[PDB]
């Protein structure tokens, strides 16, 4: 067999994304016979150069995950990606640390496979157009560019939240993501800063191809806006050398291989 085409012939373009009918992961499995244990899929038709680990920070969002899986699995297969789904579950009830969980995902996914691309995605964002490929590009890729919760318009040009993708090399280049952002906000801006300090720009699909649906939800406990976020964002230049992949520590409490994904529950410590 030969390399997959630059653009997938299976793409359908815009899709109707709704969270009305409840999801049955069992039906989802039935509807996705080709996904292997642990949420792994590899094209049988052609050879994909995109070995993608899709990393989702998570804690008490099982209902959102169901919808995420229901929509994304069909989409990713249509995008002809050799992918694996990873849900990094934060054990305990300390402040949520999104970026640190994303770093855990990076290291843990690499134990399973020779991934060269990492997509980091909120558990509640679903792309509305399959032309918005969940893979890596020559420059860090911001994927959820047009979120319905922001009026289908990017909130600010330096915005890197929601869904993004970094090749393995781009990720290594910035010493991964920060581990010191506890609570909501700012970590995505620190990551943006890191990428910019290493001379990279942000690649993005246009706002039509990048339309994204958000699952409206009440705010979670233990993820209140971080009071130190603005002061931290202003010092990324210096803290990125000492806070990242190179200073990451955590304990794995459990690894679950389900047919639609791998869920790693980890103890990532507390604000220090």
């Amino acid at each position: 067999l030969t390399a997959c085409p630059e653009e997938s012939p299976l793409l359908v373009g815009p899709m109707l994304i709704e969270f009305n009918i409840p999801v049955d992961l069992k039906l989802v499995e039935q509807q996705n016979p080709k996904v292997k244990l642990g949420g792994r899929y590899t094209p049988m038709d052609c050879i994909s150069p995109h070995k993608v680990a899709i990393i989702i920070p998570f804690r008490n969002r099982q209902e959102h995950l169901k919808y995420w899986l229901y929509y994304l699995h069909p989409i990713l297969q249509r995008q002809q990606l050799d992918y694996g789904i990873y849900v990094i579950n934060q054990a305990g009830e300390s402040m949520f640390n999104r970026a640190k969980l994303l770093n855990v995902g990076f290291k843990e996914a690499l134990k399973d496979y020779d991934y060269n691309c990492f997509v980091f995605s909120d558990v509640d964002l679903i792309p509305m157009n399959d032309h918005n490929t969940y893979r890596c590009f020559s420059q860090p890729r911001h994927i959820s560019v047009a979120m319905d919760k922001f009026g289908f318009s990017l909130p600010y040009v330096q915005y890197f939240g929601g869904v993004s993708a970094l090749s393995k090399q781009q990720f290594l280049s910035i010493n991964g993501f920060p581990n010191n952002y506890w609570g909501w906000g700012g970590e995505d801006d620190d990551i943006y800063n890191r990428l910019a300090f290493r001379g990279m720009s942000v690649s993005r699909p246009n706002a039509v191809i990048g339309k994204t649906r958000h699952i409206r939800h009440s705010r979670d406990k233990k993820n209140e806006p971080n009071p130190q976020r603005f002061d931290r964002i202003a010092h990324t230049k210096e803290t990125m050398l000492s806070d990242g992949l190179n200073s990451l520590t955590y304990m794995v409490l459990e690894v679950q291989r389900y047919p639609l994904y791998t869920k790693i529950t980890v103890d990532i410590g507390t604000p220090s």
């Binding site: 009026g151 909130p155 600010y156 040009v157 330096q158 801006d189 209140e224 806006p225 009071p227 603005f230 002061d231 964002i233 202003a234």
Partner: protein
């Protein structure tokens, strides 16, 4: 209510240039400060910040949680949680005159460059 950048820019026009801060800078600061939500309520701890401008009950408005507050703006913090921004603006001006733009921590890190994207072109 979650306002839009232009709704905000139109609402706070009177603050343009005050203490040297432009509308573009304010549009930027307010997005990062409260996401343009007039009902935003957030803590650091022991104190709470209200509305579009995230005016704190520590020294600026009086809240039931801290009635002893200096209440420099001379106002109930609940008046900072509605869609009438005139009193929020007068309070913000006091903060600007007394403490300065540094009260808003997002300014420096988020609003020192690429200010043009914050422009409102709607008459």
């Amino acid at each position: 209510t979650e306002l839009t950048k232009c709704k905000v820019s139109h609402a706070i026009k009177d603050i343009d240039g005050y203490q040297g801060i432009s509308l573009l800078e304010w549009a930027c600061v307010l997005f990062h400060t409260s996401g343009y939500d007039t009902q935003a309520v957030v803590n650091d701890n022991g104190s709470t910040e209200y509305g579009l401008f995230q005016i704190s009950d520590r020294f600026w408005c009086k809240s039931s949680e801290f009635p002893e507050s200096e209440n420099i703006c001379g106002i109930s913090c609940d008046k900072l949680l509605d869609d009438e921004l005139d009193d929020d603006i007068a309070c913000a001006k006091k903060i600007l005159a007394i403490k300065g733009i540094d009260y808003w921590k997002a300014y420096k890190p988020m609003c020192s460059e690429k200010l043009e994207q914050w422009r409102c072109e709607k008459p």
